[PDB]
Design a protein around this ligand. Structure first.
Ligand SMILES: CC(C)(O)C(=O)Nc1ccc([N+](=O)[O-])c(C(F)(F)F)c1
Lengths: 242, 9
């Protein structure tokens, strides 16, 4: 199966946050580390995305844009999966060196959001998602958020997204039951991602006030791209309404 | 900006 071969071959490996675990659970220390981990994972998301089947069919500005818009959901989805598979969703496995318990959930001031993500992670267990389903779904998530006014060359995108949906079908192949649920799980990512976007944006704006450091790419993306989403110029593609 | 530079590698 050429398609699954590729996804498996390009899947990023382990990414560490560089968190000081020997040190008090500070709000600023935890979030400075999430922000650094965000940067690290975005580099991996870029190298992954560029390697995906058909990705170069897209106009290079649409290439950049779809990564930037999708980055948060892709991270949310991969993290739920790591959480599921390392700790059976008992805690949130952001990275080997940044595993969130309830206490950290609370101290990060992201408890409500962390609760959503753990519930997503429990879903991977409740539905018996396979590693290959995971991989297909994550690739499709990359093509699941676009400007309401469309992309620069929309037709190439429509075709790519179309082929990623079909590859999800193939792997599924009750089927209709499977596809309903997996498409539902995929839609469930977007409102988490949206709460994460909001939190990240607010934190950026109040970050000098709270001594939270934002790396370069994070400040740029959260100030230039994320407000497109939060202002409604850019929206997720939902399978179900919503 | 920074992202396009990253993307460019
Ligand atoms: C606060 C903000 C920008 O740093 C952030 O959301 N960082 C972040 C870092 C990593 C990961 N992760 O998937 O491992 C996530 C999240 F996708 F889970 F939420 C957020």
């Amino acid at each position: 199966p050429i398609f699954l071969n590729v996804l498996e071959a390009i899947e990023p490996g382990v990414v560490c946050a560089g968190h000081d675990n020997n040190q008090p659970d500070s709000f600023a220390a935890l979030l400075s580390s999430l922000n650094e981990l965000g940067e690290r994972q975005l580099v991996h998301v870029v190298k992954w995305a560029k390697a995906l089947p058909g990705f170069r069919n897209l106009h290079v500005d649409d290439q950049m844009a779809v990564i930037q818009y999708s980055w948060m959901g892709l991270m949310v989805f991969a993290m739920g999966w790591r959480s599921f598979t390392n700790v059976n969703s008992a805690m949130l496995y952001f990275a080997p060196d940044l595993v969130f318990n309830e206490y950290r959930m609370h101290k990060s001031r992201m408890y409500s959001q962390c609760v959503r993500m753990r519930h997503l992670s429990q879903e991977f267990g409740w539905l018996q998602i396979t590693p290959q389903e995971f991989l297909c779904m994550k690739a499709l998530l990359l093509f699941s958020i676009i400007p309401v006014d469309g992309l620069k060359n929309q037709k190439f995108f429509d075709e790519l997204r179309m082929n990623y949906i079909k590859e999800l079908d193939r792997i599924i192949a009750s089927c209709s039951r499977r596809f309903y649920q997996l498409t539902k799980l995929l839609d469930s990512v977007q409102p988490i991602a949206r709460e994460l976007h909001q939190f990240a944006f607010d934190l950026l704006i109040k970050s000098h006030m709270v001594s939270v450091d934002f790396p370069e790419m994070m400040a740029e993306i959260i100030s230039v791209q994320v407000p497109k989403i939060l202002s409604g110029k850019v929206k997720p593609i939902y399978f179900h309404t919503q | 900006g920074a992202f396009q530079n990253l993307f460019q590698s």
